[PDB]
Amino acid sequence: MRAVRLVEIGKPLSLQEIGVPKPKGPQVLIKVEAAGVCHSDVHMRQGRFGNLRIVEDLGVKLPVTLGHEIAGKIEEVGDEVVGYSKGDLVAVNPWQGEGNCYYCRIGEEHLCDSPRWLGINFDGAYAEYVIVPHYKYMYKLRRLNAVEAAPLTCSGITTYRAVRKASLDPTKTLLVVGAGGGLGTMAVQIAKAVSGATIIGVDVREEAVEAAKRAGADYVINASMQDPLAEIRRITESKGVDAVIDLNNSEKTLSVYPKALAKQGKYVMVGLFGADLHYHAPLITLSEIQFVGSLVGNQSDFLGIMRLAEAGKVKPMITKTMKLEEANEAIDNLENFKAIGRQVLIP
Amino acid sequence: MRAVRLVEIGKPLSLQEIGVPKPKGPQVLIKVEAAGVCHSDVHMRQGRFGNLRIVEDLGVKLPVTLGHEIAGKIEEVGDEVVGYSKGDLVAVNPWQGEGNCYYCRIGEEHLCDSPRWLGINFDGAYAEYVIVPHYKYMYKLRRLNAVEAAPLTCSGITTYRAVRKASLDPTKTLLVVGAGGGLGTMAVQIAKAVSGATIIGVDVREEAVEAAKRAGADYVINASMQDPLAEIRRITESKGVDAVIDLNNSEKTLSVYPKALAKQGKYVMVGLFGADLHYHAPLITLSEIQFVGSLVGNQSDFLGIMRLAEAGKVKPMITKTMKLEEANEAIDNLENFKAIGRQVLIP
Amino acid sequence: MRAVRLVEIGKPLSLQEIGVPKPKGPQVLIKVEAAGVCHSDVHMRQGRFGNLRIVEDLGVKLPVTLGHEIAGKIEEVGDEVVGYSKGDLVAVNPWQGEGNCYYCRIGEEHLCDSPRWLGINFDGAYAEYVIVPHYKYMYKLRRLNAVEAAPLTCSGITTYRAVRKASLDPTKTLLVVGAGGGLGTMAVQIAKAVSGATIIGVDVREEAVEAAKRAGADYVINASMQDPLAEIRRITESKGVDAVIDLNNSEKTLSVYPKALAKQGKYVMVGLFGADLHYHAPLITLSEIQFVGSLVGNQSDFLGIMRLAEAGKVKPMITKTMKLEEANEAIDNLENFKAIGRQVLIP
Amino acid sequence: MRAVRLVEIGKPLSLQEIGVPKPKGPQVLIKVEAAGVCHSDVHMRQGRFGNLRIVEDLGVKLPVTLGHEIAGKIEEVGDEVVGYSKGDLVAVNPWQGEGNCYYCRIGEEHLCDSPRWLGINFDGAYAEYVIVPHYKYMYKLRRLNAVEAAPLTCSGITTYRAVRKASLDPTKTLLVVGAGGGLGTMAVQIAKAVSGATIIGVDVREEAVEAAKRAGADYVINASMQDPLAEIRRITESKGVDAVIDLNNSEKTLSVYPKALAKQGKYVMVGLFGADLHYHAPLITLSEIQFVGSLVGNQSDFLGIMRLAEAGKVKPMITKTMKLEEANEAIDNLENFKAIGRQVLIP
């Protein structure tokens, strides 16, 4: 089968011809019908997230097929698989745990001590077929098609968990930083669909700000055209925002938005652009603000985003679909910030 | 009446003779029987917490009587006060809110927009008498004497709130940084009394480490005699700690202990030594750690620490009591780190 | 001023001429612009909730002006009131606490040991003016008019609290019993606006079922035309519902809907029709279901429903407005179940 | 191997000679070193819990080996088992789920749609060996011996979950009904070890009341010697208790203790004696009390009780150990209420 893999750090992904794996035990072989392209693949291709080298620091062994936003058709199942037939369309949660470690036992599968992350340290969906380590991480699609579903296995589940950690309610205001992108448009949608909170989206490109407006943001700010702090101060009447979901975490965002936090404000850190958080400690203490990291999601979150989307309450804003052979171009679009919403590969 | 007040920044507190206030409305005039000395008064005397000047940045108007760990006898009450008689011994929650702002309405009175903090921006207990803005912030002592009670209105309520925010349970390990001090000995006790969690206390003085051992810590480390990270790594079997309560937040603690956090670890920031938090953002995100500020406590927290102490489940470790005229010497002991547990003034 | 009061149990409310109270201290005199009519006033007029006599069992002292859904204009304030001017339009939370008891201290003011409930044990809004015990229980209207606001001080805040206690999320299904009524239409809206959960509304009148459909229910059932259990079984695919908000709690509802609960299901009991809950204990234990009572709401809940409505995310379905002199007729409509949505008096 | 099994309802358990199962896949064959005797086995032998027949209503297929408090030595593992060696001493969580259903995905394994409950619908520990469906449900003992550990797999995990659902804190009072029994002594211990709450234990036998006193109860009541309601009213100063953990749920307890609940009180229903809950609905609503069922525990709870016990913070009060051949006599002791604490079989 054809596969687009990360063969060498700092080089374009490589289109290779490799064998189709045989599913055994609880594994499932999925015929890929859609593979979302995440800005994380820009970092993968660069070989790192900040100063955390995927090889030396995270244990990633090259070559590896990328693609962790997964949706497809069941081709073959192992002997232990129960509840699926050939042809069934499913979304796949790629953040899998082995089930016995501390984190797996308390329902935090994605923080497993021996993680199996399809598209990161295990082969992903940028191919004709993909192996699912365990069938319990799949979701039978009922209303969604594969293209709409794929993005939910990362951008959806990640922002669903992030919106929950932001502890939002009708009396609060949320600020989404980088609201016009893949996760940004998703964070805005979920917050609109289930929190009742007022939403402010900020980006730095005309089309991105427009995308955030389309995603449902009550207020949108173009940080290139105006001072976002003055505007946020105006919108919240000097109270500041109760929560920020930063989908960048660059020196540009981290040196600005934490100052917009209200007392008890939660700064949810999702983006992986690679900067260092730097804030005066007494200021954190006196305002009781929090800086909380959020990583993809667990089985519970997956269930949550999939049911929300199946109900039509949220829907990935797919602005572009292209062939698997165009994986590098789709990634260049994110690296050059020439994309909005989400792009999906349709092998 | 005699009062020890902060008259000038960077100078010794001043013993003055001032008028005794007349309680009106819901106010209450308390005859001070005990006034705890907090390391925060070292910062007050220096005129700042980190680079946050108490005058220009926090609105503190000099002169102001210090002393926010309050316990005493009811001398006189206003016309609105209901439920107290002259002579009743009470502990006083000094972190008072006006009751109508957003934070007061959601039960976070210490984060009131118009805070009345006895000993900080309003006169405190380093005097013969002290005015209590509102009687609902008092607790009638049933078993505790004034000396034992006073420290609970700051070191107790603060660390009670911090231990709650650390989200501890029997499967977790807590690390208390500066465990031999006033708050340190209290954090260790509360965590021992109600979380079931394993406790590690770290300090840098032989007597402090011993105090932390006496407070109930399962493991104690003298960071002056050995590498605390190697030891914490050994105790937690390389898992790291699920929570840290840092009662320093100095460049020395912040550049070390965050590295000891396990995945999902919570770094509760209480200390006000004045450094800057600096940590690689991708590391925060990938391990889902959190840096959360905690400030004194609300009416709910107060109730919690007072009942815990009245039941004899925790008890401030008072290692020294002295006269009100000795306020500066007691503060010097904290500034020079020549104290353990808690010191209390007995006017 | 004119007032419609409960003078005698089992008799029509009485239109009387009484003196206008003078606001002192933190009290506020409100010129009533709208007074919602709640089915609770049907019980008040009958002198009881189930077998709990309002006089002998609850301490209600007759005569008392009814009306606890309050919205109006500030006429006069006491000496302590801060932040309001004559003419300001406000909604009033009638479930007031004195502020010092255990329940007031933990932010559950409606469960105060010495409750001041306007319209129940204190004079209410079925009059030209009404006294507000404490100004902190008011909310300044920004977008809502008085008629739209009034119902939020009971049907809104109550069902907001009930929807929160139902612990809903996108993977869950909520069942609202009596969904076409005043609270029913509100419960459905709030659940639609902030939980992401699938909603099933059930009633027994064609117009009520239609109202519930208009409120946003995904599925509606007329228990008079069909077996509600068979239908709920079909909709949830035999899983049952994760939560039920019963706005009746009659022998007719309690002997039916608890059987529709899924494992861990929460049966939120709001209605006061007066029956006895009867369920096999082993069944409760083995399926971990819960029967939880919910009563009006606290200051936090009030804030939540008011902000949700001001944002236009929910809006009371007012199906009828009439003059204060018509109070008895409006109550008869609820007693005879010849009403849907909410009725509001406009003195 | 020898096994004590439920062969016929209403008859004494039968000592049979059956084959030793062969562990395959993730299964594990454990050599039983201790098997706790639970009052649930009295109900099993009677063929029902209340009016819920274990055969017709729960799907239990006879014959079945009883015994769900499990601790033993690893004899043999399947091909998928990872992390264990022959001889390793482990405690076994018998409340196992298949891992794919809704409840398994949200971390509520014990509420699995296709439950595998060792000792209930699958063979248990009342034998020489026992098969563990999945190895991830085991806990490697480090400090506890098998006899001390076994009881934690039911009485411990169940009461750990129940104490957590009681939402206890230092300002609250807990009432344990049947506090001198197997679960009672455990509930009292855990509440003493991790809640900070004041504890009241009630029983009706002199030795049972004494056992509850030894378990750590602050107050003990013998309901045979005095009116428990008058005493509870006295202890709580008429406030009532914030939580009740009823380990009976008989007409005798259910018609008494709910009346002792404070406003917002939580009545946790654990016992399976078989009565019907009957309480006036308006009373539930007006006091916001809750009746919540609690069933054994999930993987998270198991981790919690095992770590609490390994730390020596709680310890089953084993008052009797006897041979496997004496299973019926041990059960008669519970059925006749001639036992306190916990009894363990040592095959």
Ligand SMILES: NC(=O)c1ccc[n+]([C@@H]2O[C@H](COP(=O)([O-])OP(=O)(O)OC[C@H]3O[C@@H](n4cnc5c(N)ncnc54)[C@H](O)[C@@H]3O)[C@@H](O)[C@H]2O)c1
């Ligand atoms: N924590 C997790 O589990 C997780 C999961 C998925 C992706 N991510 C990370 O999230 C980040 C975003 O991913 P994505 O797929 O949404 O990317 P994207 O390229 O679709 O969107 C990024 C957005 O950031 C905006 N942006 C750039 N500079 C900005 C500035 N100075 N201020 C405000 N906005 C700015 C862009 O205009 C763009 O709309 C990446 O670093 C990715 O690796 C994290």
Ligand SMILES: NC(=O)c1ccc[n+]([C@@H]2O[C@H](COP(=O)([O-])OP(=O)(O)OC[C@H]3O[C@@H](n4cnc5c(N)ncnc54)[C@H](O)[C@@H]3O)[C@@H](O)[C@H]2O)c1
């Ligand atoms: N956030 C809040 O609401 C709040 C409330 C009260 C106090 N505080 C702050 O908490 C801090 C501690 O106050 P306290 O009264 O306990 O002080 P303290 O002087 O009693 O104790 C401080 C402890 O820190 C230890 N220490 C010093 N250097 C150390 C190092 N490098 N590593 C480890 N331990 C070290 C000392 O030996 C001492 O035992 C102060 O900065 C104070 O202002 C904050």
Ligand SMILES: NC(=O)c1ccc[n+]([C@@H]2O[C@H](COP(=O)([O-])OP(=O)(O)OC[C@H]3O[C@@H](n4cnc5c(N)ncnc54)[C@H](O)[C@@H]3O)[C@@H](O)[C@H]2O)c1
């Ligand atoms: N717990 C609280 O704090 C609180 C607050 C407000 C009102 N209430 C109580 O809530 C109840 C409802 O009040 P409301 O103002 O919404 O009343 P309402 O008269 O507006 O609505 C009641 C609804 O119940 C429906 N109904 C009647 N019989 C039914 C049956 N057998 N099955 C299903 N639906 C049926 C009616 O058709 C109607 O739509 C009253 O008992 C009231 O006292 C409680």
Ligand SMILES: NC(=O)c1ccc[n+]([C@@H]2O[C@H](COP(=O)([O-])OP(=O)(O)OC[C@H]3O[C@@H](n4cnc5c(N)ncnc54)[C@H](O)[C@@H]3O)[C@@H](O)[C@H]2O)c1
């Ligand atoms: N929900 C669950 O998951 C779960 C788990 C284990 C056991 N259980 C159930 O818990 C119940 C208790 O089990 P156990 O093993 O502790 O039993 P046990 O026999 O050890 O203890 C029961 C206690 O109840 C006391 N008692 C009897 N009548 C009483 C009365 N009128 N008032 C107060 N106390 C009274 C006895 O004196 C005795 O100490 C059983 O019905 C059992 O099936 C439930």
Ligand SMILES: [Zn+2]
């Ligand atoms: Zn991604």
Ligand SMILES: [Zn+2]
């Ligand atoms: Zn794992």
Ligand SMILES: [Zn+2]
């Ligand atoms: Zn202090």
Ligand SMILES: [Zn+2]
């Ligand atoms: Zn305030």
Ligand SMILES: [Zn+2]
């Ligand atoms: Zn009402």
Ligand SMILES: [Zn+2]
């Ligand atoms: Zn009160």
Ligand SMILES: [Zn+2]
């Ligand atoms: Zn049992």
Ligand SMILES: [Zn+2]
């Ligand atoms: Zn299952």
